Design a protein around this nucleic acid. Structure first.
Ligand code: MG
Ligand code: ZN
Lengths: 63, 118, 50, 1477, 189, 76
RNA sequence: UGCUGA
DNA sequence: AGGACAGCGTGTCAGCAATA
DNA sequence: GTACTGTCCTCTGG
């Protein structure tokens, strides 16, 4: 049973101490899902106004 | 930073290996050959691909046009055609290895590639 | 029964006297913002790079 | 000594299966291929007779080692026959349509013989014979049909032989493709048998590896093989043509071929050190063969045993399938990818290792700015230079410098790593003893000479490439300037825009030609100064950038004075002259103190660069910096002064000396017609490169020595007393939400302050969501009024420092970097945020951000940012700005992903189109696409100065242009009589016929007696044969009552002479130019002979020398033979898209047009002008109201359904608010319900119930005459008061809320509409020149349903974006121009402008064969190249096709020429050299 | 642009630590121990590059082609020098000898740490705290730099054309804030 | 006899390349070289003097060809 | 497969 | 012959770890 | 993703 998850990869990742600002950002990251990296429509990438105070507007990978 | 001259030639296609750890070549690509022929520099596009990549010197049954047919005697080592027993028809043709690899792959299905030598 | 020109700054293409611009950042995070101009007398759209 | 033998042709066929034998060194039988330790197990897949897989061993078949042995083939002999997976599907059809009893196809012999004869004629090329045979048939026993067709077919094949070589052309492959496809698609279905009526032994195949004949038996490949063997016998004459002399045996396999072991290399996989995916599939086949060979022996030592035999058969087929196509069989595992996956994909074998090989002698490193090496040079960092080696032959005139190289050694720079011997090879010098290198420095010149592999020697030619290669200018050749101690490749900044390099970590590749024949082409063709103009629109590509533009604009300004010593040391530092005296100037100011001007520095730098023999150029143009940028203080009226006669806006170079103008980006830049563009025209591309280099050096020395450029905070600051107005305007902008939204919902003008919030909420939670976008749009408007008021307050004159002295202005204003919208948005406003063309989205509760109340009217809540980057933006505005900046990046990624594919498809279809030696644009097979490249020749980059308005430049610089290029030699070696006489004839004709659409004719010309006849002659008759009483008199007088040979009304009515380019070969015929160029030349000669008269300057040029000059400059701009213009058109349509309101825009539209060629487009439209007559204007109102669709649902209030007796009252709307613009009446509307809705209702009731388990009287009666359910409706004698109906199904029906059905049906029920038109609209004005124009645009497409209004609307000037509808009402030559105009209008919305000569070629290729054909995977089926067409997409379907048809390839495409290692047949390879003996 | 004297006085010098775990249970399967770091006495191959346990000296410099380890198949009695193949210079700074988790391992696993000096060359990417990235294109001599009226001389030269299109007005404020801080001994937020 | 009299740029490129590959293989130089070690500079020197005995064989799209002399071809 | 660079 | 539908498709560019 | 080809699928015409 997939554990009621919907994702079966990228569940754990390497935490790299290149800097202490790369390391501290692994324990505050939130991944919408690894399947959404393959989608024609871009609507799970919209920065809605309901993530005010819960997700940072600026801190997102830029590729 | 990478510079490759010659080095690991991939065995399946006789082409430079790639990566940076070994000599590592630079894939040319399908997008770039188009620009090189727009300039009408056919010979630069010939020299680069054929001579810096898989340039091979295969033999053909000129009468029957098969790459697979020519044969070497066990040690003179004069080529003789297996399909038709003629030894003086065989002559060399410049061709790639991936061309030979493709003739082999097509035979792996009973398909025949008959080629006209001139 | 009962119960879009932009801010418009001045630049010419065919005639003169005032286009109108929409700014959109149609670029990456290492670049700057592109500008979209539109004329008044006619309707000719520009689409610069900055 | 190379093989010397070349390839002419490659054909794909099928191997006999008996000739594969003797193509086999041994049969393999041992399953386990890997030895206990990892070596080859004897008789396994990896064997030593199938070749040495690795260098360790020697083959048993021929003694020879790896790298010298061509591998050998072997065969897993199968226990019993299996079907071949590629020829399998066809087999199925060959068994579906056939009588297993009779063994004959169920097709009428008419079709069989017709198709047989059509194929017989196609094999030789005859293409009219196809339809001729079909019509001969239709106009006509089995022998009877055969003899009727075979006579004609043999006559064709005999009289039209000698054409077997001229049959491999498009239009001959499309016909055969279509014929055989139609056959397989329409005539191979299961049918009752002709001869025996009961011969349908229905073969019906389950998943592959399974064919089941009925009385549900399992078809054994042996029974199917015998069926095919006995069907061929009866129907072979026909199938030998449908398949090539195919033997039916080829459809079945009795062995599998194991490819040579050198092509199957053991790597590793999880928990397995030595495994190839191909050997793991072949091992599975060998293992099943072994289990099956055991069961056969079990039968021999003798339902489960044979059920097991039939199950292991199906398993052996699903493995032999997987061996051919990994995904043919979906129910098996341990399935590694087959050959379809080895060949056919982006990873593949064609798009990798075939078109994209990896190359030796190449480097890649980060690129760094240089600027002190000439524009044609690259800096090499002494680490590539010591490794990159050119293999030069040793000869008497180089043996000295080569000797120093072998002595310098492998590691010192002018050295060499090796020397190849005459017969031997590769004696490496890399030793560092320094004595053996000297021992071998001798014996050079001591057959083919020794070749020294020398290093790069500071003059070599290198090809440089940046990886997103989107145009020809992305690969250019450079001149190897060697630099010591670095690992970066240094490149001039003029070559940046060409590559798109940015010096932020920008790795770039450098290739080193090794042939001495690719060096000649890198020097002549690929050089980086022949690349000055982009091939997209001919505009310059190389130019100076950034601080070379702010430096040159501040030095060439009027108040820059230099002393003798700053004048000098600024001239010599730009020149660095090496040859000859630097010619200087005289001080402009000679007295109080000798002083120079800065324009004089540029002047004196310009007269030294221009070549000594040639003379300085004259030039007149405009500057980028407007003459209004300098107006500090209000301009006062000077009575007699034209301020622009003496302005810094007009650039005036007079004999190489700048006399006026600033010389900003408009020159030195990437703008056309500037100083460097004219230098490149008159004096060549090397002189323009020299000018660029020297001007860069001069403008750097200026800023580095005497001036300086910076950008502080006091040039982005804004004056106080100007920020007060900004603040008050921002305060005013915080009150414009209620009015905006309200007046967009058309609400009561006031008195509602909460009804507006509710209406906004309703519009937000609505389903259509187009009354919400209305509010969004009418809101980004009051906010935009305040910004205009805000930018105007601060940016022009509210800045603390103004343009001459502001550093931000003078950087965006001279084209250096940036824009006035960057300058603003740094000061005084950031703007209105827009994500998808709309404001930021709201939450699910109606608030856009947690800080804002739900449904808040303030523009701030919708993304209107009034903050600037000067004084930062608040958190809520930060959020919206981040949303926008992030959508930008997402869109970039996706856009590039789509553009890459579009461009790949285009380039893969238009690649073989090259200009031939007869100036005609032909494809690879000779098919004429165009008879003249741009419709006139004249490649793009050379036609830049042939425009008018550039003649006053060619006239001013006439002496330089004749001396530098054409010279007096060509002008007097020209003979223009043939072409000049033709133009005189054309001019005389057009003089006698002013209106060229007036129906010229001999007899028509003999209607001037019209009065002579109408007077008295014809007054007595009727329409004898329909013509007239008076027309017969004219016919009689003309017919034979006129002179025999002197009735020459013909000459007064003859055609215009055909254009000169058509008859007189523009290349070898002087003065033969285009009909639009000679008109321009006439106009300019007439406007130039009337300027010399009042000129106060002596002109030593005559109108008839200027004419010859222009004619030569035309004849020389003529698209050299071999140009390969289709690739240039592909790349010119691709690059702009890859980089970059009720219609479609962007790549969607380009893909609709080019790649899909759809008959269904998202936004079809029309536009007919309105005829400009008083009656037409009145009729159009009714016309618009006549074509809009009125649907039952658009006219309804609400239904009232009662329920098995289901009543229904429609309750229609009053006419007050729908008859105004719909042209409807209530009797028609109600009559509609009686005849269409009330019977479609029973139609839908049956749709549900089939799978469920005085005058009122006549109308009601006829209506229930037709249906048995209704009882009685109603009548409404007063405006449809109450109009219900009643139904009843009394026995048993599913009584539910059927309102659902009668509501889902009362929406798609339309009263009446013109087919295809959804709405019209009259966009009042479309012109300023003749503003009086009116246009009746539409949002549907029906061309004929407008032909009825040829008096209300102009049906010439009718336009539509459909291109398939135009191609069906007006033809294909009319769809060409619609295609071209559509592409042009798609590119126009972004300011891009592709040259018309490219769209002409694209449209001519798309519409080549009579139909609008898509430029995609289905367009290549009509292509004469199997090797192409499989290097594109679906490579295995195109290989199966080419194989079952015996399709032959001529090796004339670029792809087929690069697959077999030939030289492409365009550009440099288009001719021989033929050394004479 | 980076001043050359600033770069020679230690501006932005750096290093990389490449730790390589050599577990030598590879090169062999479950047979006899072919794995013990060790040097057969007198091997001409490792005359003075290893230190009698087939491990480089701590502090030694390594270059391509230098000896890097020497196993010894205990039964046969044969050594294998295993040369250093990276085309870059480093210094060995530590070597951990590890056991098997039961304190019973036999000199089969080691971890060598090499130190690679990576000072700012030409082609290295620098950045500010405002997204203004850029490679290092020159090292401008310290006597060719524009000196100020206070005797100072910049150590970074930043072209003023990255501001107009990128609108990073925070860099122009950070410059003034940091200059005021360095002047007054303060620390602004 | 009907094609253009001038030498297209592709023809110049291929003729220079072939003459250079010949010179480099020890062919006699009919141009009196003056101390230059590049075979391509020598080939350009020969093309400017009108000493190249090569025959450009221009192929038409139907197989028909026309044989032009490198001397009888207007080099721009 | 997770990263990273244009 | 009005459909219903099952069926193929592509997708810029190079590196590293690491592991099937 | 959508739109294309394809594929029959078998419904009223001689
Ligand atoms: Mg970059
Ligand atoms: Zn043979």
């Amino acid at each position: 049973t997939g554990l009621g998850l919907l994702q079966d990869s990228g569940l754990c990742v390497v935490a790299d101490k290149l800097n202490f600002i790369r390391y501290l950002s692994h324990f505050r990251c939130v991944h919408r899902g690894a399947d959404f990296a393959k989608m024609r429509t871009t609507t799970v990438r919209r920065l809605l106004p309901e993530s005010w105070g819960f997700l940072c507007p600026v801190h997102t990978p830029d590729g | 930073f990478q510079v490759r001259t010659t080095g690991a030639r991939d065995r399946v296609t006789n082409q430079p290996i790639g990566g940076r750890n070994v000599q590592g070549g630079i894939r040319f690509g399908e997008m770039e050959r188009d620009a090189l022929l727009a300039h009408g520099t056919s010979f630069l596009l010939h020299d680069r691909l054929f001579n810096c990549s898989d340039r091979s010197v295969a033999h053909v049954c000129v009468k029957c046009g098969s790459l697979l047919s020519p044969l070497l005697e066990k040690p003179n080592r004069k080529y003789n055609c297996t399909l038709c027993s003629r030894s003086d028809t065989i002559d060399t043709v410049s061709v790639p290895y991936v061309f030979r690899y493709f003739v082999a792959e097509l035979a792996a299905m009973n398909i025949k590639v008959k080629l006209d030598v001139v | 029964l009962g119960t879009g020109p932009v801010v418009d700054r001045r630049c010419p293409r065919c005639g003169h006297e005032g286009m109108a611009y929409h700014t959109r950042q149609m670029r990456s995070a290492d670049e700057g913002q592109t500008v979209f101009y539109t004329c008044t007398n006619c309707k000719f759209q520009e689409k610069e790079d900055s | 000594n190379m093989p010397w033998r070349r390839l002419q042709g490659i054909s794909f066929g099928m191997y006999s299966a008996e000739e594969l034998k003797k193509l086999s060194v041994k049969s393999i039988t041992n399953p386990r291929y890997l030895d206990s330790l990892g070596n080859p197990s004897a008789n396994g897949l990896y064997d030593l007779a199938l070749g040495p897989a690795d260098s360790k061993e020697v083959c048993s078949t021929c003694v020879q080692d790896f790298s010298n042995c061509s591998g050998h083939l072997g065969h897993i002999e199968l226990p019993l026959t299996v079907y071949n997976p590629l020829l399998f599907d066809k087999l199925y059809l060959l068994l579906r349509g056939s009588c297993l009893n009779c063994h004959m196809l169920t097709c009428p012999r008419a079709v069989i013989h017709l198709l047989l004869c059509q194929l017989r004629v196609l094999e030789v090329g005859a293409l009219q014979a196809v339809y001729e045979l079909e019509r001969i048939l239709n106009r006509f026993s089995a022998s009877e049909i055969r003899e009727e067709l075979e006579q004609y077919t043999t006559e064709i094949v005999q009289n039209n032989l000698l054409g077997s070589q001229g049959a491999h052309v498009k239009n001959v492959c499309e016909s055969k493709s279509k014929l055989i496809a139609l056959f397989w698609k329409a005539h191979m279905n299961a049918k009752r048998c002709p001869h025996c009526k009961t011969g349908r032994s229905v073969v019906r195949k389950e998943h592959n590896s399974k064919l089941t004949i009925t009385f549900r038996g399992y078809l054994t490949p042996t029974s199917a093989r015998e069926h095919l063997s006995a069907l061929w016998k009866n129907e072979g004459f026909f199938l030998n043509y449908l398949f090539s002399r195919f033997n039916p045996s080829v459809f079945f396999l009795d062995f599998l071929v194991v490819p040579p072991s050198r092509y199957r290399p053991v790597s590793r996989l999880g928990d397995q050190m030595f495994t190839n995916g191909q050997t793991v599939n072949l091992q599975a086949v060998m293992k099943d063969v072994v289990l099956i060979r055991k069961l056969l022996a079990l039968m021999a030592q003798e339902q489960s045993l044979i059920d097991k035999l039939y199950n292991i058969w199906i398993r052996l087929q699903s493995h032999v399938n997987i061996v051919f196509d990994s995904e043919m069989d979906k129910l098996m595992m341990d399935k590694y990818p087959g050959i379809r996956q080895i060949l056919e994909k982006k990873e593949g074998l064609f798009r990798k290792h075939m078109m994209g090989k990896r190359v030796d002698y190449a480097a890649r490193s980060v690129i760094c700015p240089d600027m002190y090496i000439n524009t044609n040079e690259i800096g090499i960092p002494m680490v590539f230079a010591t490794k990159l080696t050119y293999p030069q032959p040793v000869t008497p005139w180089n043996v000295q410098e080569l000797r120093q190289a072998v002595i310098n050694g492998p590691n010192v720079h002018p050295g060499a790593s090796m020397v190849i011997n005459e017969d031997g090879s590769r004696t490496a010098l890399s030793a560092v003893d320094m004595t053996q290198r000297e021992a071998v420095a001798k014996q050079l010149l001591t057959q083919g000479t020794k070749i020294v592999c020398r290093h790069v020697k500071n003059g070599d030619i290198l090809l440089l490439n940046r990886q997103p290669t989107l145009h020809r200018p992305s690969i250019q050749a450079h001149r190897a300037r060697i630099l010591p101690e670095e690992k970066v490749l240094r490149l001039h900044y003029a070559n940046c825009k060409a590559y798109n390099a940015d010096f932020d970590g920008d790795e770039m590749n450098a290739h080193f030609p090794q042939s001495e024949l690719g060096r000649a082409e890198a020097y002549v063709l690929a050089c980086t100064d022949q690349q000055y103009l982009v091939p997209k629109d001919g505009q310059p590509l190389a130019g100076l950038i950034q601080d070379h533009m702010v430096s040159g604009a501040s030095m060439t300004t009027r108040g820059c004075f230099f002393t003798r010593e700053h004048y000098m040391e600024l001239v010599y530092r730009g020149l660095t002259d090496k040859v000859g005296r630097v010619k200087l100037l005289s001080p402009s100011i000679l007295k109080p103190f000798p002083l120079w001007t800065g324009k004089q520095v540029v002047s004196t730098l310009l007269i030294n660069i221009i070549p000594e023999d040639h003379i300085p150029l004259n030039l007149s143009g405009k500057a980028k910096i407007t003459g209004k940028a300098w107006v500090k203080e209000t301009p006062r009226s000077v009575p007699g002064f034209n301020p622009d006669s003496m302005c810094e806006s007009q650039v005036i170079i007079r004999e190489g000396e700048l006399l006026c103008g600033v010389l900003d980006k408009a020159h030195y830049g990437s703008s056309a017609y500037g100083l460097v563009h004219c230098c490149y025209e008159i004096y060549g591309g090397e002189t323009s490169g020299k000018v660029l280099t020297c001007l860069a050096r001069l403008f750097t020395a200026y800023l580095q020595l005497y001036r300086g450029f910076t950008l502080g905070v006091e040039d982005i600051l804004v004056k106080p007393k100007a920020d007060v107005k900004r603040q008050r305007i921002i305060e005013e902008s915080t009150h414009c939400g209620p009015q905006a939204v309200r007046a967009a919902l058309n609400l009561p003008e006031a008195a509602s302050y909460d009804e507006v919030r509710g209406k906004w909420q309703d519009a937000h939670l609505g389903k259509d969501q187009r009354d919400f976008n209305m509010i969004d749009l009418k809101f980004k408007e009051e906010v935009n009024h305040y910004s205009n008021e805000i930018n105007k307050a601060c940016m022009p004159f509210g800045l603390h420092r103004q343009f001459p002295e502001n550093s931000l202005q003078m950087m965006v204003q001279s084209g250096a970097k940036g824009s006035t919208v960057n300058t603003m948005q740094i000061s005084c406003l950031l703007g209105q945020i827009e994500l998808e063309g709309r404001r930021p989205p709201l939450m699910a509760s109606g608030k856009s951000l947690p800080c804002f109340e739900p449904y808040e009217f303030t523009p701030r809540a919708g993304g209107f940012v009034t903050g600037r980057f000067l004084t930062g933006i608040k958190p809520p505005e930060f959020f919206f700005h981040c949303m926008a900046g992030r959508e930008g990046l997402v869109d970039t990624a996706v856009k590039t992903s789509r553009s890459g594919y579009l461009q790949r498809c285009i380039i893969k279809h238009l690649e073989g189109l090259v200009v031939q030696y007869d100036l005609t644009v032909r494809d690879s097979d000779g098919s004429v696409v165009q008879f003249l490249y741009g419709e006139d020749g004249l490649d793009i980059p050379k036609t830049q100065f042939l425009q008018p308005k550039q003649f006053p430049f060619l006239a001013s610089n006439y002496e330089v242009i004749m001396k530098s290029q054409h010279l007096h030699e060509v002008l007097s070696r020209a003979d223009p009589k043939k072409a000049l006489h033709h133009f005189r004839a054309i001019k005389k004709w057009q003089s006698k016929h002013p209106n060229t659409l007036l129906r010229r004719g001999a007899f028509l010309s003999y209607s001037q007696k019209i009065q002579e006849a109408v007077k008295a002659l014809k007054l007595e008759s009727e329409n004898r044969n329909g013509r007239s009483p008076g027309t017969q008199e004219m016919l009689r007088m003309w017919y034979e009552l006129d002179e025999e040979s002197r009735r020459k009304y013909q000459k007064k009515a003859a055609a215009c002479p055909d254009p000169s380019l058509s008859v007189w070969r523009p290349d070898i015929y002087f003065a033969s130019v285009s009909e639009t160029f000679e008109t321009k030349v006439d106009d300019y000669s007439q406007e130039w002979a009337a300027q010399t008269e009042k000129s106060y300057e002596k002109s030593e040029l005559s109108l008839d020398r200027l004419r010859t000059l222009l004619q030569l400059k035309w004849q020389r701009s003529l698209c050299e033979p071999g140009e390969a213009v289709g690739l240039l058109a592909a790349q010119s349509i691709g690059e702009p898209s890859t980089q970059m309101m009720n219609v479609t825009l962007g790549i969607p539209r380009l893909r609709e047009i080019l790649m899909v060629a759809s008959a269904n487009i998202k936004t079809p439209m029309m536009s007919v002008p309105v005829l400009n007559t008083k009656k037409a204007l009145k009729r159009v109102k009714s016309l618009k109201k006549q074509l809009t669709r009125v649907c039952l649902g658009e006219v309804l209030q609400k239904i009232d359904v009662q329920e098995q007796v289901y009543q229904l009252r429609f309750q229609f709307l009053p006419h007050a608010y729908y008859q105004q613009e719909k042209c409807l009446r209530p009797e028609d509307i109600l009559r509609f319900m009686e005849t269409r809705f009330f019977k479609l209702l029973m139609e839908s009731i049956k749709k549900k119930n089939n799978k469920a388990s005085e005058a009122m009287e006549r109308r009601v009666q006829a209506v229930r005459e037709i249906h048995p359910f209704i009882d009685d409706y109603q009548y409404d004698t007063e405006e449809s008061l109450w109009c219900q109906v009643t139904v009843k199904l009394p026995l048993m029906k599913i009584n539910f809320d059927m309102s659902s059905l009668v509501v889902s049906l009362a929406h798609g029920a339309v009263i009446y509409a013109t087919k295809g038109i959804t709405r019209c609209l009259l966009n009042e004005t479309t012109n300023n020149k003749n503003e009086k124009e009116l246009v009746l645009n539409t949002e549907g497409i029906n061309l004929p349903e407008l032909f009825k209004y040829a008096e209300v609307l102009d049906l010439r000037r009718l336009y539509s974006n459909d291109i398939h509808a135009i191609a069906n009402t007006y033809g294909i030559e009319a769809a060409l121009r619609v295609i071209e105009k559509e592409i042009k209008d798609v590119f126009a919305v972004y300011g891009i402008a592709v040259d018309p000569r490219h769209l002409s070629l694209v449209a001519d290729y798309m519409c080549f064969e009579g139909v609008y054909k898509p430029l995609n995977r289905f367009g290549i089926r009509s292509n004469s190249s199997p090797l192409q067409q499989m290097t594109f997409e679906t490579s295995f379907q195109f290989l199966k096709q080419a194989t079952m048809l015996g399709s032959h390839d001529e090796l004339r495409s670029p792809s087929a020429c690069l697959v077999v290692g030939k030289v492409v047949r365009g550009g440099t390879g288009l001719f021989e050299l033929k050394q004479p003996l | 642009i980076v001043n050359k004297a600033s770069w020679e006085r230690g501006f932005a010098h750096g290093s990389v630590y490449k730790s390589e775990f050599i577990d030598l249970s590879e090169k062999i399967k479950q047979g006899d121990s072919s794995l013990v770091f060790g040097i057969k006495p007198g091997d001409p191959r490792v005359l003075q590059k290893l230190d009698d346990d087939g491990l480089p000296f701590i502090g030694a410099k390594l270059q391509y082609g230098d000896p890097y380890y020497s196993y010894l198949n205990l039964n046969t009695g044969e050594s294998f020098v295993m040369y250093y193949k990276s085309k870059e210079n480093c210094v060995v700074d530590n070597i951990k000898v590890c056991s098997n988790d039961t304190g019973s391992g036999k000199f089969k696993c080691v971890c060598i740490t090499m130190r690679v000096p990576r000072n700012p060359t030409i082609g290295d990417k620098f950045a500010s705290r405002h997204g203004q990235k850029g490679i290092l294109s020159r090292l401008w001599p310290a006597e060719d730099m524009p000196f100020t009226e206070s005797g100072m001389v910049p150590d970074i030269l930043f072209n003023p054309h990255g501001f107009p299109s990128r609108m990073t007005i925070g860099m122009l404020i950070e410059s003034m804030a940091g200059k005021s801080a360095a002047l007054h001994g303060l620390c602004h937020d | 006899r009907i094609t253009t009299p001038y030498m297209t740029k592709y023809e110049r490129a291929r003729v220079l390349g072939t003459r250079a590959l010949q010179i480099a293989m020890c062919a006699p130089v009919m141009v009196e070289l003056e101390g230059e070690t590049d075979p391509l500079l020598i080939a350009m020197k020969e093309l400017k003097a009108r000493k190249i005995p090569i025959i450009i064989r221009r192929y038409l799209p139907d197989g028909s060809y026309e044989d032009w002399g490198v001397d009888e071809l207007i080099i721009t």
